[PDB]
Every structure is written in C-alpha cells, then in structure tokens.
Amino acid sequence: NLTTADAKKILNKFNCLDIAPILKPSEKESVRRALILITKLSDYQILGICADTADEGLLAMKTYSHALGYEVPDLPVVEGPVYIKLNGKNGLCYLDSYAGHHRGVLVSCQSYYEGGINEMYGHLPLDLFV
Ligand SMILES: [Cl-]
C-alpha cells in the first residue's frame, strides 16, 4: 500500500523533465498508482499534453482522463506536433499546434484548501495509461 510521501517521491522523479522517459512495465504501474493517489488528494487537475502527432496526443488525453475519472470529448486535429489542454475545474479542452520541444503530460493538481495538493508533476509518459 502506497503512502502519500511515497507517491510524491515517485512523481518528483519527473520534476522539470522536458521529455518523458520510456518506462518499463512495472515502473509504469508504480507511477500510475502514485498519480492516482495524489490526484485524490486534490480537488481537480489540469492536463497539458505535448505529443509528436495529434493521434498520440489524443490517445494520452483519452487514457489519462479516464484513469482520473474525467469525461472527455472529438477535438479537431492539426498536422505536426500538438499541445492539448484539459482543464478539470472549468472543462476547457483544446488542441493546438505545438512549436515547443517538450513531450509527455504535465498534471497540475490543485486544491482550494490548505492541506490539499497544489503541485505540478511531469512530464510523465504519453503512454502511462496504455
Ligand atoms: Cl514539474
């Protein structure tokens, strides 16, 4: 069973990583469990997804949002690398053309109340929940 401090330690391994690593199967399981625990200790999450193609990005969006318990929409696509935002507080969701060099998912966990998590983690793997 995973403690909050353990979960944070796991996620903090990705602190300031611009490009998410390719993780082994059991590493992914640990990161999944850590992320799910931590997000229960926050009121909502905002996702920022950078991917080489719309398809990879949209797959990340659909799989993360499901594991986090969020409903999602169809976003129109663009050619080339993409950035996708999914705002869990106000429902904002969009896909843009992305000219940057990061890859993976940033998960901003926000809480209205002190004691709650107010941290951003990643970049975490696009395929973390695949
Ligand atoms: Cl970070």
Side-chain angles (χ1 to χ4, degrees), residues 2-32 34-70 72-113 115-130:
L2 203 60
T3 55
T4 296
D6 282 328
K8 290 178 164 195
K9 192 148 169 294
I10 293 163
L11 297 182
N12 288 345
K13 299 179 86 189
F14 301 81
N15 188 56
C16 303
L17 285 188
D18 289 346
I19 295 180
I22 178 56
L23 299 178
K24 302 182 159 113
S26 73
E27 286 173 335
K28 286 202 199 177
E29 175 65 31
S30 290
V31 173
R32 283 199 286 259
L35 184 63
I36 289 161
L37 183 164
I38 289 299
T39 65
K40 292 175 174 167
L41 304 186
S42 59
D43 289 319
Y44 66 87
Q45 300 89 48
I46 298 168
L47 306 182
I49 304 167
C50 304
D52 285 336
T53 67
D55 288 340
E56 295 170 3
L58 288 168
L59 183 55
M61 183 193 70
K62 70 170 73 136
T63 52
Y64 275 68
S65 65
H66 187 275
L68 279 44
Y70 283 120
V72 266
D74 266 307
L75 290 177
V77 303
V78 301
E79 283 194 311
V82 307
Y83 174 81
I84 291 162
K85 172 83 75 176
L86 185 129
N87 185 316
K89 85 152 102 45
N90 59 27
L92 182 56
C93 281
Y94 60 77
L95 186 156
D96 287 342
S97 189
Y98 178 64
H101 298 102
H102 301 168
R103 291 301 184 260
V105 182
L106 289 167
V107 186
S108 289
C109 300
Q110 324 271 37
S111 307
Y112 290 102
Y113 283 97
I117 296 275
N118 276 297
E119 292 269 296
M120 193 173 69
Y121 306 97
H123 292 85
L124 310 173
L126 289 168
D127 75 333
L128 179 60
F129 291 101
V130 184

